[PDB]
Amino acid sequence: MVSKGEELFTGVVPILVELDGDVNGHKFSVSGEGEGDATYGKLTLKFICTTGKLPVPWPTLVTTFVTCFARYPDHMRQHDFFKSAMPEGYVQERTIFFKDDGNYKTRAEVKFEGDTLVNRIELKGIDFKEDGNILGHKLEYNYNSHNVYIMADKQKNGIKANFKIRHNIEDGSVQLADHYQQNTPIGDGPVLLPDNHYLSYQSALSKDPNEKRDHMVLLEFVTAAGITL
Ligand SMILES: [Br-]
Ligand SMILES: [Br-]
Ligand SMILES: [Br-]
Ligand SMILES: [Br-]
Ligand SMILES: [Br-]
Incomplete structure (x- = not known):
């Protein structure tokens, strides 16, 4: 049978993203819109910095911007x-x-x-070097594929993960971004607590040539894979 949750995702679902951020005191906001098609693990989203210039590199926000x-x-x-x-x-x-x-x-x-899947985010960044790779905008505008190992977090009735993102820099090195993640349900309803498994990601960043505002277009695919060999 198709679960209550599953049925909400059988077609194309509009997505709305809102982020309020503050990094080393630099405040900024970003809105995003697009669509998700879970059948194909597919995300298509366009983000606009509504406060002017994004003070961090767009790639550093990709993992933050609907699993x-x-x-x-x-x-x-x-x-x-x-x-x-x-x-x-x-x-x-x-x-x-x-x-x-x-x-x-x-x-x-x-x-x-309603019919819209919303991702509402607050982000706070601290202890950045004003001339480091982030505040100094030294990251290439691109993105690597990555596998994320998802584990159950029974104590918290949800899941957790940790994974390392590599952001390429043009001198051939990478900026590591080490992610520690915890997800917990908002409702008190029943949820699926998973056996360990992977989510495989690919992400492509681009620009809308007709867009003058600071922005990012993201195309991202996410597919789960099991551990039964
Ligand atoms: Br701060
Ligand atoms: Br605007
Ligand atoms: Br950027
Ligand atoms: Br998050
Ligand atoms: Br995702």
């Missing part, structure tokens, strides 16, 4: 915590430690408002 759109293969459906929490939704929290630089702390609520 309910992941494609879970049929044999993996029991492990999809993210859809099981809908429509009431879940809180996603991270600390992202940039190696040799500062860290982001994020809190996002992901939930439906």
Whole structure:
């Protein structure tokens, strides 16, 4: 049978993203809009910095900007915590430690408002070097594929993950962003607590040639894979 959560994602779902950020005291906001198609694990989103110039590089916000759109293969459906929490939704929290630089702390609520899947985020960044790779805008505008190991967090009735993102720099090195993540449901309803599994990501960043505002276009695919060999 198709679960309550699963049925909310059988077609194309509009997405709205709102972020309020503050990094080393530099305040900024970003809105995003687009669509998710969970059947294909597909996200298409365009983000606009509504406060002027984004004071951090767009790539550093990609992981922050809706894992309910992941494609879970049929044999993996029991492990999809993210859809099981809908429509009431879940809180996603991270600390992202940039190696040799500062860290982001994020809190996002992901939930439906009517037919729209909303990702509402607050982000606070501290201890950044004003001329480091982040505040100095030294990251290439691109993105690597990454696998994320999702684990159940029984104590907290949700999931957790930690993974390292590599942001390429043009001198051939990378800026590491070490993610520690915890998701917990917003409703008191039943959720799926998964066995350990992976989510495989690819992300492509681009620009709208007709857009004068500071912005990012993101195309991202997420697919789950199991550990039964
Ligand atoms: Br600060
Ligand atoms: Br605007
Ligand atoms: Br950028
Ligand atoms: Br995602
Ligand atoms: Br988050």
